[PDB]
Design an enzyme around this catalytic site. Structure first.
Site, PDB file in Angstrom:
ATOM      1  N   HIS B  53       0.847  -1.179   0.000  1.00 52.08           N
ATOM      2  CA  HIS B  53       0.000   0.000   0.000  1.00 52.08           C
ATOM      3  C   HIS B  53       0.889   1.238   0.000  1.00 52.08           C
ATOM      4  CE1 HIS B  53      -2.384  -3.082   2.206  1.00 52.08           C
ATOM      5  NE2 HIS B  53      -3.455  -2.506   1.693  1.00 52.08           N
ATOM      6  N   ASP B  56       2.165   1.878   3.433  1.00 46.84           N
ATOM      7  CA  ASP B  56       3.182   0.991   3.991  1.00 46.84           C
ATOM      8  C   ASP B  56       4.579   1.531   3.730  1.00 46.84           C
ATOM      9  OD1 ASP B  56       1.172  -0.889   4.665  1.00 46.84           O
ATOM     10  OD2 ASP B  56       1.467  -1.975   2.779  1.00 46.84           O
ATOM     11  N   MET B  87       2.565  -5.995  -7.954  1.00 45.26           N
ATOM     12  CA  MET B  87       1.253  -5.477  -7.613  1.00 45.26           C
ATOM     13  C   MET B  87       1.413  -4.373  -6.576  1.00 45.26           C
ATOM     14  SD  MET B  87      -1.209  -5.568  -4.944  1.00 45.26           S
ATOM     15  CE  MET B  87      -1.335  -7.090  -4.022  1.00 45.26           C
ATOM     16  N   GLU B 180     -10.722  -6.752  -4.926  1.00 45.66           N
ATOM     17  CA  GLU B 180     -10.593  -7.791  -3.902  1.00 45.66           C
ATOM     18  C   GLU B 180     -11.855  -7.807  -3.045  1.00 45.66           C
ATOM     19  OE1 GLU B 180      -7.808  -9.108  -0.180  1.00 45.66           O
ATOM     20  OE2 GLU B 180      -7.098  -7.635  -1.618  1.00 45.66           O
ATOM     21  N   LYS B 182     -14.630  -8.861  -0.052  1.00 43.81           N
ATOM     22  CA  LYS B 182     -14.670  -9.314   1.333  1.00 43.81           C
ATOM     23  C   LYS B 182     -16.104  -9.093   1.802  1.00 43.81           C
ATOM     24  CE  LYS B 182     -12.162  -9.038   5.750  1.00 43.81           C
ATOM     25  NZ  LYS B 182     -11.367  -8.145   6.658  1.00 43.81           N
ATOM     26  N   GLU B 216      -9.492 -13.699  -2.300  1.00 45.25           N
ATOM     27  CA  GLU B 216      -8.679 -14.144  -1.177  1.00 45.25           C
ATOM     28  C   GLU B 216      -9.312 -15.381  -0.555  1.00 45.25           C
ATOM     29  OE1 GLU B 216      -7.147 -11.285   1.746  1.00 45.25           O
ATOM     30  OE2 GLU B 216      -7.794 -12.667   3.294  1.00 45.25           O
ATOM     31  N   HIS B 219     -11.481 -14.774   2.614  1.00 47.28           N
ATOM     32  CA  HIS B 219     -12.664 -13.917   2.477  1.00 47.28           C
ATOM     33  C   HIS B 219     -13.871 -14.686   1.956  1.00 47.28           C
ATOM     34  CE1 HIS B 219     -10.013 -10.054   2.376  1.00 47.28           C
ATOM     35  NE2 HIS B 219      -9.939 -10.719   3.513  1.00 47.28           N
ATOM     36  N   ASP B 244      -4.920 -13.915  -3.641  1.00 46.58           N
ATOM     37  CA  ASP B 244      -4.380 -13.814  -2.282  1.00 46.58           C
ATOM     38  C   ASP B 244      -4.528 -15.177  -1.634  1.00 46.58           C
ATOM     39  OD1 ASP B 244      -3.823 -11.075  -2.427  1.00 46.58           O
ATOM     40  OD2 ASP B 244      -5.242 -10.497  -0.868  1.00 46.58           O
ATOM     41  N   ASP B 254     -11.699 -12.251  10.053  1.00 46.95           N
ATOM     42  CA  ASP B 254     -10.688 -12.531   9.035  1.00 46.95           C
ATOM     43  C   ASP B 254      -9.361 -12.919   9.712  1.00 46.95           C
ATOM     44  OD1 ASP B 254      -9.545 -12.501   6.328  1.00 46.95           O
ATOM     45  OD2 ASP B 254      -9.074 -10.387   6.613  1.00 46.95           O
ATOM     46  N   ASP B 256      -6.482 -14.492   8.326  1.00 44.97           N
ATOM     47  CA  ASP B 256      -5.248 -14.364   7.534  1.00 44.97           C
ATOM     48  C   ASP B 256      -4.141 -15.302   8.033  1.00 44.97           C
ATOM     49  OD1 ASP B 256      -6.634 -12.447   6.052  1.00 44.97           O
ATOM     50  OD2 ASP B 256      -5.440 -10.776   6.865  1.00 44.97           O
ATOM     51  N   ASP B 286      -1.306 -13.093   1.406  1.00 45.37           N
ATOM     52  CA  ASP B 286      -1.846 -12.022   2.234  1.00 45.37           C
ATOM     53  C   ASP B 286      -2.157 -12.651   3.593  1.00 45.37           C
ATOM     54  OD1 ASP B 286      -2.945  -9.836   3.413  1.00 45.37           O
ATOM     55  OD2 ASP B 286      -4.682  -9.702   2.111  1.00 45.37           O
TER      56      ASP B 286
HETATM   57  O1  LIG Z   1      -4.533  -3.828  -0.779  1.00 46.81           O
HETATM   58  C1  LIG Z   1      -5.436  -4.904  -0.576  1.00 46.81           C
HETATM   59  C2  LIG Z   1      -5.150  -5.494   0.761  1.00 46.81           C
HETATM   60  O2  LIG Z   1      -5.504  -4.470   1.662  1.00 46.81           O
HETATM   61  C3  LIG Z   1      -5.774  -4.809   3.031  1.00 46.81           C
HETATM   62  O3  LIG Z   1      -4.618  -5.002   3.851  1.00 46.81           O
HETATM   63  C4  LIG Z   1      -6.633  -6.056   3.148  1.00 46.81           C
HETATM   64  O4  LIG Z   1      -6.718  -6.444   4.524  1.00 46.81           O
HETATM   65  C5  LIG Z   1      -6.105  -7.198   2.316  1.00 46.81           C
HETATM   66  O5  LIG Z   1      -7.165  -8.117   2.239  1.00 46.81           O
HETATM   67  C6  LIG Z   1      -5.936  -6.772   0.890  1.00 46.81           C
HETATM   68  O6  LIG Z   1      -5.319  -7.768   0.114  1.00 46.81           O
HETATM   69 MG   LIG Z   2      -6.261  -9.645   0.734  1.00 44.96          MG
HETATM   70 MG   LIG Z   3      -8.086 -11.357   4.892  1.00 42.41          MG
END
Ligand SMILES: OC[C@H]1O[C@H](O)[C@H](O)[C@@H](O)[C@@H]1O
Ligand SMILES: [Mg+2]
Ligand SMILES: [Mg+2]
Ligand SMILES: OC[C@H]1O[C@H](O)[C@H](O)[C@@H](O)[C@@H]1O
Ligand SMILES: OC[C@H]1O[C@H](O)[C@H](O)[C@@H](O)[C@@H]1O
Ligand SMILES: OC[C@H]1O[C@H](O)[C@H](O)[C@@H](O)[C@@H]1O
Ligand SMILES: [Mg+2]
Ligand SMILES: [Mg+2]
Ligand SMILES: [Mg+2]
Ligand SMILES: [Mg+2]
Ligand SMILES: [Mg+2]
Ligand SMILES: [Mg+2]
Lengths: 387, 387, 387, 387
Positions: B53, B56, B87, B180, B182, B216, B219, B244, B254, B256, B286
């Site tokens: 992200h 991050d 990605m 994605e 959820k 994912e 999810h 994912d 969730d 993970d 993920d």
């Molecule tokens: O950028 C997408 C990601 O963002 C968040 O951390 C979500 O928890 C994760 O599910 C997803 O893959």
């Molecule tokens: Mg994910």
């Molecule tokens: Mg998850």
């Protein structure tokens, strides 16, 4: 009070009030109903019409002569009473030949038989006036991972619905198809398990305009999903052709309780959406009077379906008509949700410093949404603790 | 044994091994990781690349000068090591300004800010070599029924993705989008809650060819759905752009977990499908090392992700290569599932008396599917009780 | 209308209205509340009292001097206002030292620390007037199967509660313990996951009379269980010492919505049971105002908790007082459920030919239970479509 | 390889391999099996014994003469083959007279009949050698909240089991009772829905030592609970009298898949627990061969039950015997979990400054639990990627 009339467009499957109460662990508790009797009793309750599977009306294996006697009796009850038949469907799940599916059975000869059985009942449905033909692929699926190659099964499912669309268009029939999703039961996992998967699948058919969804309250709730949200997405896509109303208490076996039982607040928000969006199709009840009940209880449960719809309709109308609720909706900025984000266009947005460079993120972060006050007004209206 | 190398295309988010262990009820148990250190440690484990992200990599609110120092450090770790960045994605969920959504927030000014934040990170992702840009709309949704008009929210969601597609096409970028899904958490219900709803939504965008899904494992399992089946439908539609991988024990928050934990048989059937379908995209993990672990445990959990993929790949390959399994697949008629139901056409089918009039329904009903013997061979291969 | 007063015994945790809105994916959206301010604001809303964890009131790591300043401020708000403190509890879940549990941590030294932290707060709770001391073992459990030997962990859990009971009895304190079950979150599985498991565990403690349950609406619903049924079993055992009221929409993360939200019909049947059984303990709200809300929304959500309890109480009282409902209850034989099956004794039953030899099974099988008509009367009362 | 023999104590209900495949939506796909044939076929597969409901063996309504002919045939198959009958139970769920329950039906005369039907089959079970008598109260429960006063229903349930205990003790029979919990299906909610609720209920019976639990893998998983954890609590209480083994894929209808299918890792941890705790009772399979199968598939599915138990037993034994796993268990402090927290006593603990005053909370917080490395060793052993 809250008396249904034919203008409310309430409809019922023959298989609903006619369910004899046989479940996985128990024998039938009620005698079989004559379809002619169900038509007359539902007419007296204020229903608009009935629906049927082929096998609800004509016993499986009936000769062509026997078939005509069952249809003639049924038509004259419709003519005498004048109940409507707005929808019909095929039973591709009860007979042992369908134990691995109809349209997606691994055996090719079963798939051909499934298509011929369906086509025969489309002809009948069109004769009786049905506008929507429902398909519930209850046996399409698997208990184990190797049993079904799902890409091939979706090819076969597409092939079957494409052939059905070619049939109705070559006949000149004015009838559309609606796929009814369910995530599981009686198969371990059923193909096209939710409204979303069914909407996505339709877009790969040769004539997508002929196909929509028939979502059922309890089926989406068997996946823990929000049923009003899923209905909203189907309306947004132009695909809500029909709907099955009933109740379900969470993630477990398909209960098919009477509408209003189960998740009561979701039923309120569903009726609010259907009425405010102007849904004009049948309000169809796909429910099972519990097998604890005798025949008096069957008709009381059916009446309760319609009653609860009419009460919820009244409370939702009062909610939306309340000026205090309109003020609450403005305080939560529901009106700003309807404005385009960037009707000034991409280039204007990129050059707008108030959208990023000079955006005061902390002031915006501090605004409350006022969602709890809005939801308590909705609770007050649902409970009749204001009008 | 089972040693990963860059050719296995295993990738990891910075936010995965870098998760400090703060959960709804607890403070962080691990110090923050330097992204440069994660790149180097993942390179040594045999990873192919990393994902991120915006937040991050660049602390939220960083000046343009500070931003460039973070990016330069990160690029030189990539250059020294030569890890890939296949990605990237946007954080539209952590900051309080996004508490009601990014693209579907009721406040218009927040929606414009969300789009400008996303566009800025697309530029960076393209510079670093990303092929896929993921969107996880974790705040798009509601806790209560009146808070969100879902038809308007889907209009706003469509508007935002259409503007993103107009941006990338006007820039000439070779990057595609992956949504994605959820079903819930952190909102009570999240919009586009499953793979099916996301696939259906894509078909209403102005340029559908630019968009696919990033499903994912955990999810879809939070809705009790069959993850390999949903992946099969995404492959059938041509939309599996990214994936994912992780683990989840049923319907709950969730988790993970590391890939292979959770539903082990579903992981086997997933790897069987991905490999036999020739999926060529990243195998992205993920996952969150549990907050019980110190930094040794973080890297052991990451290594276990790749190890379990490689073991399952070996067992699935052995399953499909076994002549006894090929014979079992023929006994269950998986080969007949791949033949067209009616390539002779609708008219031929209607005139075929062996498909209905002379179909021996009882003989067909009596054939066993032999699915249990097939599934026990699959169990034997998974457990290594044959080769 | 429906105005709460202290006689309604509504209570609130400091951590409820004081929740700053930090969730697994997001930062806080509200500033921290001063406990003194919460006491005064809740007093003005009509609350009866407050509850607390040690760490809600005294910042973790506070010196003995700092501790006394926090307690003195808090006591004078109680004295000025005269709010009650009917319950208190320990925070054995936030600090990283508890990442594997308090009472059942694998490390012995952590288990000893957990007991000393708990004992220190029992002394304080007794000083402030608490009648019930709650234990929620939120970190007791595991993500993986090898991490916890559950028989040893139950030995350690029994050891800890036995030591607590020895402490209170040696001090002469008039305080009882209540175990609060939860099935999962933040651990993958939590020990004593439901009301039933907690009731069973209590029966193996050295002094079972000192211990009961503090069930929470949403926690039992996270396992898909019927919360009124579980409360009924706790009342039947004499163990309902305290209760947490809130709302939850099905099987997913712990939502802690305001009471009345979530499963509305279950809330109706819960209030009907509590009132008709004469439950006299606190009506405690363990809820989180959604992080979408500002401080006005916090207090509106808290007021809605009490309002919805008072409305449901009124509707349940009207239901039970309606002569038409009393007649329905007789038609469904609820009065026969209260008669002993065989007060004539085993030998009389064995010699009674009308109980087997001459029992007319088919006549008995044909009686309807009339349950649907009863449930529609309950629906009508809940919705205020009769009085 | 992995060949079962009678010493493995594998047992099967007549109703398992004899299930004809009728489900809520479908007719039977297999003919009825003669109990004599099932005994002989199971003997040849290596089974230890069989179990039965009264109505599996003697058709409902049979005369006393007809009853004796069915029992004599069955006994001579047992004598010729020498299969054991370790457990038996009553069918209080199939006949319409039980539609509202047996022991907790609102109608008193049905409750008396239910007790006489049960007592008659206890006599037979003791004659054939059964050590455990199972009760599954599948109809005890409700679809709606007003239908059942649950405190009265628990009084009636206690009355019935107390009368059964008085009967067996007055006869001098050496047989114990085991309650089999299930959370729902066929009733909307079933009373005593989990292992915990059943254990708690037993403690209020007049002679608790006569009663234990018969937990079923899939039933606890229908509530999303951890089945090995629940078995651990039943062992800790001394109440695991019997067990039903099968498979279930999550929260949905009761699947009764073959053991090993469903949650494979939970099956591994279950077998590890049963073997390491020295469970000596029958390994009973309560499973349904899917209705896709013919009779060859029925026997293959039954053989797979035993095979998967034997494979998992081997892998769990290898896991515990591996010195690298013993070292991992010490690194995660599983050995410290078995030491008493405070065998030095309450007063010593209160005076120990190293337990609170001088406890270094931050050093303790920094220790990793090493749980992921342990769990990856368990994964490696399960998959046979080490020995
Ligand atoms: O950028 C997408 C990601 O963002 C968040 O951390 C979500 O928890 C994760 O599910 C997803 O893959
Ligand atoms: Mg994910
Ligand atoms: Mg998850
Ligand atoms: O025809 C479609 C109908 O068929 C079956 O009875 C299904 O159980 C019901 O869900 C569906 O509406
Ligand atoms: O003290 C007990 C309380 O502690 C925690 O905040 C839990 O989340 C809440 O469920 C419980 O009531
Ligand atoms: O007798 C008890 C048995 O009865 C029923 O067949 C139940 O479905 C099964 O769960 C149980 O083990
Ligand atoms: Mg249904
Ligand atoms: Mg339906
Ligand atoms: Mg909670
Ligand atoms: Mg609580
Ligand atoms: Mg079962
Ligand atoms: Mg069983």
């Amino acid at each position: 009070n809250y008396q249904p009339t034919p203008e409310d467009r309430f409809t019922f499957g023959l298989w609903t009030v006619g369910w004899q109460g046989r479940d996985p662990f128990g024998d039938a508790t009620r005698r079989a109903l004559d379809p002619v009797e169900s038509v007359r009793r539902l007419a007296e309750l204020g229903a608009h019409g009935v629906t049927f599977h082929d096998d609800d009306l004509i016993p499986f294996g009936s000769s062509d002569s026997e078939r005509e006697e069952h249809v003639k009796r049924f038509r004259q009850a419709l003519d005498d009473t004048g109940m409507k038949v707005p929808m019909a469907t095929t039973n591709l799940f009860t007979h042992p030949v369908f134990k691995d599916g109809g349209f997606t059975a691994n055996d090719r000869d079963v798939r051909r038989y499934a298509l011929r059985k369906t086509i025969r009942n489309i002809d009948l449905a069109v004769e009786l006036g049905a506008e929507t033909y429902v398909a519930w692929g209850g046996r399409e699926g698997a208990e184990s991972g190797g049993a079904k190659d799902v890409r091939d099964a979706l090819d076969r499912m597409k092939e079957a619905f494409d052939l059905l669309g070619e049939y109705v268009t070559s006949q000149g029939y004015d009838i559309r198809f609606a796929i009814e999703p369910k995530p599981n039961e009686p198969r371990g996992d059923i193909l096209l398990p939710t409204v979303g998967h069914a909407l996505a699948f339709i877009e790969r058919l040769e004539r997508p305009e002929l196909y929509g969804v028939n979502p059922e309250v309890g089926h989406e709730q068997m996946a823990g999903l929000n049923f009003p949200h899923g209905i909203a997405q189907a309306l947004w896509a132009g695909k809500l052709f029909h709907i099955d109303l009933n109740g379900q208490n969470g993630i477990k076996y398909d209960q098919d309780l009477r509408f209003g039982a189960g998740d009561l607040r979701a039923a309120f928000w569903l009726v609010d959406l259907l009425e405010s969006a102007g849904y004009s199709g049948p309000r169809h009840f796909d429910f099972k009077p519990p097998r604890t009940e005798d025949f008096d209880g069957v008709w009381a449960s059916a009446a309760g379906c319609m009653r609860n719809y009419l009460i919820l309709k009244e409370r939702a109308a009062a909610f939306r008509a309340d000026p205090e609720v309109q003020e609450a909706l403005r305080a939560s900025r529901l009106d700003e949700l309807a404005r385009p984000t960037a009707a000034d266009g991409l280039q204007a947005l990129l050059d707008d410093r108030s959208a990023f460079e000079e955006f005061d993120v902390d002031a915006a972060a501090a605004r409350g949404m006022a969602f709890e006050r809005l939801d308590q007004l909705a609770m007050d209206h649902l409970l009749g603790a204001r009008g």
